[PDB]
From Swiss-Prot, chain A:
Function according to Swiss-Prot or TrEMBL: Component of the 26S proteasome, a multiprotein complex involved in the ATP-dependent degradation of ubiquitinated proteins. This complex plays a key role in the maintenance of protein homeostasis by removing misfolded or damaged proteins, which could impair cellular functions, and by removing proteins whose functions are no longer required. Therefore, the proteasome participates in numerous cellular processes, including cell cycle progression, apoptosis, or DNA damage repair.
Full protein name: 26S proteasome regulatory subunit 8
Subunit structure of this chain's protein: Component of the 19S proteasome regulatory particle complex. The 26S proteasome consists of a 20S core particle (CP) and two 19S regulatory subunits (RP). The regulatory particle is made of a lid composed of 9 subunits, a base containing 6 ATPases including PSMC5 and few additional components. Component of a complex with USP49 and RUVBL1. Interacts with PRPF19. Interacts with TRIM5. Interacts with NDC80. Interacts with PAAF1. Interacts, in vitro, with the thyroid hormone receptor (in a thyroid hormone T3-dependent manner) and with retinoid X receptor (RXR). Interacts with ERCC6.
Gene: PSMC5
Subcellular location: Cytoplasm; Nucleus
Transmembrane residue ranges: none
Family of this protein: Belongs to the AAA ATPase family.
The organism of origin for this protein: Homo sapiens (Human)
Swiss-Prot record, chain B:
Subunit-level organization: Component of the 19S proteasome regulatory particle complex. The 26S proteasome consists of a 20S core particle (CP) and two 19S regulatory subunits (RP). The regulatory particle is made of a lid composed of 9 subunits, a base containing 6 ATPases including PSMC1 and few additional components. Interacts with SCA7. Interacts with NGLY1. Interacts with PAAF1.
Modified residues annotated as Phosphothreonine in this record: 341
GO MF term set: ATP binding; ATP hydrolysis activity; proteasome-activating activity; RNA binding
Residues shown, of full length: 91 to 440 of 440
This protein's UniProt keywords: Acetylation, ATP-binding, Cytoplasm, Deafness, Intellectual disability, Isopeptide bond, Lipoprotein, Membrane, Myristate, Nucleotide-binding, Nucleus, Phosphoprotein, Proteasome, Ubl conjugation
Sequence ranges of Basic and acidic residues compositional bias: 1-13
Name used for this protein in its record: 26S proteasome regulatory subunit 4
Organism: Homo sapiens (Human)
Swiss-Prot record, chain C:
Native organism: Homo sapiens
Cited InterPro entries: 26S_Psome_Rpn1, ARM-like, ARM-type_fold, Proteasome/cyclosome_rpt, RPN1_C, RPN1_N
PC repeats: 334-367, 368-404, 405-439, 442-474, 482-511, 640-652
Protein name: 26S proteasome non-ATPase regulatory subunit 2
GO cellular component: cytosol; extracellular exosome; extracellular region; ficolin-1-rich granule lumen; membrane; nucleoplasm; nucleus; proteasome accessory complex
Record's function text: Component of the 26S proteasome, a multiprotein complex involved in the ATP-dependent degradation of ubiquitinated proteins. This complex plays a key role in the maintenance of protein homeostasis by removing misfolded or damaged proteins, which could impair cellular functions, and by removing proteins whose functions are no longer required. Therefore, the proteasome participates in numerous cellular processes, including cell cycle progression, apoptosis, or DNA damage repair. Binds to the intracellular domain of tumor necrosis factor type 1 receptor. The binding domain of TRAP1 and TRAP2 resides outside the death domain of TNFR1.
Oligomeric and partner information: Component of the 19S proteasome regulatory particle complex. The 26S proteasome consists of a 20S core particle (CP) and two 19S regulatory subunits (RP). The regulatory particle is made of a lid composed of 9 subunits, a base containing 6 ATPases and few additional components including PSMD2. Interacts with RPGRIP1L. Interacts with CRY1 in a KDM8-dependent manner.
Keywords, in A-Z order: Acetylation, Phosphoprotein, Proteasome, Repeat
Residues bearing PTM Phosphoserine: 11, 24, 290, 292
Tissues/organs with expression: Found in skeletal muscle, liver, heart, brain, kidney, pancreas, lung and placenta.
Length: 49, 347, 684
């Protein structure tokens, strides 16, 4: 029940991704917007996208 | 060192790297960008990474906070390279136009490959030909056979391949494919079924009166207007003749035009033997009866008819194909056909 | 019908029952079974059972090859020794035996290495001869010489199919897909079956690759037995390398007195130039258009060179005078030798036109005159003598430039099996090694061009002394490896690269020499190991070995050139863009050549914008003047006009055309280096 402070800030939405690429980057179809190469996390690999 | 230079170029970049199309070449280290919603300030443009390589009206990397020009966009690719950038020849089964092959040859390859005649007889190469007729008789088929029958790397461009509702994606594909035709090689940018402006609409598409109108304006200004042909063979064949904007019916835009009837008895037997070869023919069946009854075989019935006749037979695992199987195959293929009176009532 | 009566016959182990069901198995084996033989897991229990156990193994191999296996399937067959053209014969022979004996032979070819496998292979080869099906049987029986005996046991009646299809496709996949050694046995058995055949050109290309002196004698005595003949000597000279022409001409001079006339010299060129004047009709306004480029004495130099290479007569030869007087030292070398370019014929006319510039007042005039005397023909060997005596100067005299000219002209004229008199005189050429790079350049170049096409090259003392004297003093270290690798040419399995790595490897000059030796050891076949070696070592920090190391592409992979386009332009070592520029070359110029030239034309550096017109206009010999006008609009320094005139010239595996452009591949030097540029005689 204490964990739930995480539930006050961001239910992060699904950003589409045309494809992956190196330099830790992708081609994200920002769904209600254009495509803008943006940052990633440090959990999954580049090929995973 | 160089690694520090790259680290600094990244320091200039904001982590959310938006994207904005350049508007005009203004080189006071700041440009006037246009993001997905058109953020147009005098935002700085990173100088060392090439600031002036990309033209106006081209996507670049953008910041979020100030939407500053972050850099040249990545190497973007349209969904048609495999069809356009090409990695059956003359005739695998001679028995059709047997002439429009030669004419498209003289109109495309002969001009393109040896353009030493238009100054030899004070002439000009054919800047455009149209070929049209029924839904499959020898229009695009000849182009497909002309793709292999040429000393150049042909390009296949489906007329609907250029239908993408992204902002300027119409003009974007025009720009891309034309930078190809002009800055890849003397190519053969074949575009078929280009008659799509007349009498229909889409659900996966917005209002075409103001969506593909400027798109077609860009395409026309590109192909046969400004940044003109030179030797850039992009010929536009069709199927109809009617529903088009006469802004290009006038010559210059496209010069020549060709139609397609359906093949004749001499060609009927030809494409029969072409297709009836795919089966161990029960030679007692009368191709000529099929040829005269089905005297208006565009080219689909022949293929479909023989394939389905083979299916009818080999449903029974027979080697020969009795006449009744051909009757059933064709009549399934040939619905709504009543060629009798009229006429029907003579000789 | 239903399997209910015929399925339970497999449960008992009765000998009469099995031996009356297994022939019933043969009968029902026309469609295999009622279905895809789902009787497997009920018959696999019968594997332990032991009269007609040959028929039992027949049934077993039938059902197993019906479902799947790789080794357990052919064992019953080799245990059967099939005993006891039909659709059931189709079943158990064509497809079944194909896959079956194919996996058997692959397993026995990669696992062991008995005779039973050769027995099966011969039986199936005869069976497919009865089937008469090539292009899958041949290509499957390629890897098991077995190939030679299969050929000479199959090649009796079908001449067109086997020879054309099999030989062409197998030689293609032998320079593209198969390595080299088995291609030698291919060559031997094809030579045999074609000695049994007609249409000598097959044996002629067999000699083009084998580099054999018995084949040429056989094809000559048979092409005299089969009396066009002038054209036959013409393209025999066009096809032969430098090694076999001297051997053939001497073995003929031993034994109609006309094959001596045809296949050495003076007969490939006797019908050509007259018919060139006859059926080819060039106008005179091109001399002017290419000549009306404003005089600059170096643009005028290049224009003199261009109009010298027009070939409808020798108009530029006798175009008055003062054009050569307008030129300068190395320009005078090019122009006095330009008269030989317009006159690459007329043995007697060559001397009567050049003796006015032979031994003349200007040193460069007489040197380029000897150069032209060597250029004009390659079978007189009488213009060699007046120069050979002079060549020795020992430091810096006239006969050193004359030695440049005459040594190059003699390496071009006569390239025997091993011509040592010119080598005994080249030993004082390399022993001098005059400060002018061209001296050692032409020394190594002539040694190679007379030693190219050798029997896997050679490790003779000549190039060894050359390596010693090159390592003595560190363009020398670039164009001496030229002649080294030229002497390396003719190799199929030479160990020259290893000895060169042993003696030569050093600071990147002799490391570049080592990689030159490496480039000249693997002309091209299936050896992709060295291809990944090159892929990695292209990332070496030295930006110069990259140049020739990647330029080796157009030689290594020239046949199926569809993969020759790489990411060299997408690479950033600008010399590698020049590498690709070279890799295009001079061939018929496909639209992909134009694909490269679309960007390689528009470049800014006066060196790579100078390297692109060479390849573009040499690859295309309106349409063609379009890049010419393109450069005319691109530039409008002096290098730009010079490369423009170079393209104007170029507009209008034989080793003869393999060295010169790699020699020129160090274009980033003075016009004195361009003084020897007029040696690229490689076109008809
Ligand atoms: N040389 C030939 N001459 C005429 N017809 C041929 C020839 N070769 C094949 N054909 C037949 O003609 C047909 C060619 O149809 P196409 O014109 O390619 O169809 P299509 O382009 O999809 O037509 P639409 O208008 O786009 S529905 C094939 O189905 C062939 O069977």
């Amino acid at each position: 029940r204490e964990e739930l402070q995480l539930l006050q800030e961001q239910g992060s939405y699904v950003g589409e991704v045309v494809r992956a690429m190196d330099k830790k980057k992708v081609l994200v179809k920002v769904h209600p917007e254009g495509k803008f190469v943006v940052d990633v996390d440090k959990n999954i690999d580049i090929n995973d996208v | 060192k160089q690694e520090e230079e790259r680290s600094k170029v990244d320091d200039l970049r904001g982590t959310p790297m938006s994207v904005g199309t350049l508007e005009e070449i203004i080189d006071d280290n700041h440009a006037i960008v246009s993001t997905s919603v058109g953020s147009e300030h005098y935002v700085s443009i990173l100088s060392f990474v090439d600031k002036d390589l990309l033209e106006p009206g081209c996507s670049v990397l953008l910041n979020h906070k100030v939407h500053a020009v972050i850099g040249v966009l990545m190497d973007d690719t349209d969904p048609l390279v495999t069809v356009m950038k090409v990695e059956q020849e003359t005739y695998a089964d001679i028995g059709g136009l047997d002439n429009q092959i030669q004419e498209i040859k003289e109109s495309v390859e002969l001009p393109l490959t040896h353009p030493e005649y238009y100054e030899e007889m004070g002439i000009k190469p054919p800047k455009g030909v149209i070929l049209y007729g029924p839904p499959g008789t020898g229009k695009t088929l000849l182009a497909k056979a002309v793709a292999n029958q040429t000393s150049a790397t042909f390009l296949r461009v489906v007329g609907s391949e250029l239908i993408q509702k992204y902002l300027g994606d119409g003009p974007k594909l025009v720009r891309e494919l034309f930078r190809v035709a002009e800055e890849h090689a003397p190519s053969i940018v074949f575009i078929d079924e280009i008659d799509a402006i007349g009498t229909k609409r889409y659900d996966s598409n917005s209002g075409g009166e103001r969506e593909i109108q400027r798109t077609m304006l860009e395409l026309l200004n590109q192909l046969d207007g400004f940044d003109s042909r030179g030797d850039v063979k992009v010929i536009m064949a069709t199927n109809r003749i009617e529903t088009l904007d006469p802004a290009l019916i006038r010559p210059g835009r496209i010069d020549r035009k060709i139609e397609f009837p359906l093949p004749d008895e001499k060609t009927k037997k030809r494409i029969f033997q072409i297709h009836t070869s795919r089966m161990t023919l029960a030679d007692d069946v009368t191709l000529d009866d099929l040829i005269m009854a089905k005297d208006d075989l565009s080219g689909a019935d022949i293929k479909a008819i023989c394939t389905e006749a083979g299916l009818m037979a080999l449903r029974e695992r027979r080697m020969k194909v009795t006449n009744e199987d051909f009757k059933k195959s064709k009549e399934n293929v040939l619905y709504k056909k009543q060629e009798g009176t009229p006429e029907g009532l003579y000789l | 019908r239903d399997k209910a009566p015929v399925q339970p016959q497999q449960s008992p182990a009765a000998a009469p029952g099995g031996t009356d069901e297994k022939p019933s198995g043969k009968e029902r084996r026309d469609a295999g079974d009622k279905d895809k033989e789902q009787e497997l897991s009920e018959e696999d229990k019968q594997l332990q059972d032991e009269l007609y156990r040959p028929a039992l193994e027949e049934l077993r191999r039938q059902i197993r090859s019906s479902t799947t296996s790789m080794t357990s399937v052919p064992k019953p067959l080799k245990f059967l020794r099939p005993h006891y053209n039909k659709r059931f014969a189709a079943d158990i022979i064509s497809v079944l035996a194909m896959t079956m004996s194919g996996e058997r032979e692959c397993l026995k070819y990669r696992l062991v290495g008995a005779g039973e496998v050769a027995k099966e292979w011969q039986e199936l080869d005869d069976a497919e001869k009865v089937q008469r099906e090539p292009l899958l049987t041949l290509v499957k029986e390629i890897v098991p010489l077995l190939m030679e005996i299969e050929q000479v046991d199959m090649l009796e009646k079908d001449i067109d199919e086997n020879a054309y299809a099999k030989v062409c496709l197998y030689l293609t996949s032998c320079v593209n897909y198969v390595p080299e050694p088995e291609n030698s046995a291919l060559l031997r058995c094809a030579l045999g079956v074609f000695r049994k055949f007609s249409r000598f050109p097959e044996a002629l290309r067999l000699a083009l690759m084998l580099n054999d002196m018995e084949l040429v004698e056989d094809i000559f005595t048979s092409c005299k037995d089969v009396v066009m003949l002038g054209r036959h000597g013409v393209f025999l000279e066009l096809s032969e390398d430098v090694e076999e022409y001297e051997d053939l001409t001497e073995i003929m001079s031993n034994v109609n007195s006309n094959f001596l006339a045809l296949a050495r010299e003076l007969d490939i060129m006797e019908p050509k130039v007259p018919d060139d004047i006859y059926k080819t009709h060039l106008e005179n306004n091109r001399f002017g258009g290419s000549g009306s480029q404003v005089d600059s004495a170096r643009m005028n130099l290049a224009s003199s060179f261009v109009n010298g290479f027009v070939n409808q007569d020798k108009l530029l030869t006798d175009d008055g005078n003062k054009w050569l007087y307008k030129n300068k030292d190395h320009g005078m070398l090019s122009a006095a030798a330009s008269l030989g370019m317009i006159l690459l014929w007329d043995v007697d006319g060559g001397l009567t036109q050049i003796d006015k510039y032979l031994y003349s007042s200007e040193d460069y005039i007489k040197s380029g005159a000897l150069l032209a005397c060597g250029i004009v023909n390659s079978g007189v060997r009488n213009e060699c003598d007046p120069a050979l005596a002079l060549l020795s100067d020992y430091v810096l005299h006239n006969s050193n430039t004359m030695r440049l000219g005459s040594i190059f002209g003699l390496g071009l004229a006569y390239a025997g099996s091993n011509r040592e008199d010119v080598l005994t005189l080249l030993l004082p050429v390399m022993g001098d090694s005059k400060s002018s790079m061209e001296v050692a350049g032409v020394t190594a170049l002539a040694c190679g061009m007379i030693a190219v096409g050798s029997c896997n090259g050679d490790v003779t003392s000549t190039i060894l002394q050359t390596i010693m004297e090159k390592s003595e003093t560190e363009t020398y270290a670039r164009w001496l490896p030229l002649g080294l690798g030229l002497n390396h040419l003719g190799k199929g399995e030479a160990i020259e690269a290893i000895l060169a790595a042993l003696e030569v490897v050093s600071e990147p000059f002799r490391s570049f020499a080592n990689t030159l030796v490496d480039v000249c050891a693997y002309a091209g076949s299936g050896n992709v190991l060295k291809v990944q070696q090159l892929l990695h070592i292209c990332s070496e920090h030295f930006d110069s070995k990259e140049k020739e190391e990647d330029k080796d592409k157009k030689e290594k992979k020239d046949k199926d050139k569809k993969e020759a386009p790489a990411d060299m332009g997408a690479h950033q070592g600008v010399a590698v863009l020049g590498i690709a520029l070279i890799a295009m070359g001079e061939e018929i110029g496909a639209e992909m050549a134009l694909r490269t030239f679309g960007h390689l034309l528009r470049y800014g550096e006066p060196t790579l914008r100078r390297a692109v017109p060479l390849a573009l206009a040499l690859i295309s010999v309106s349409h063609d003047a379009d890049p010419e006008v393109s450069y005319n609009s691109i530039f409008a320094a002096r290098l730009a006009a010079m490369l423009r005139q170079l393209a104007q010239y170029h507009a209008k595996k034989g080793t003869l055309t393999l060295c010169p452009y790699h020699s020129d591949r160090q274009l980033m030097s003075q016009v004195a280096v361009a003084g020897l540029l007029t040696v690229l005689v490689s076109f008809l």
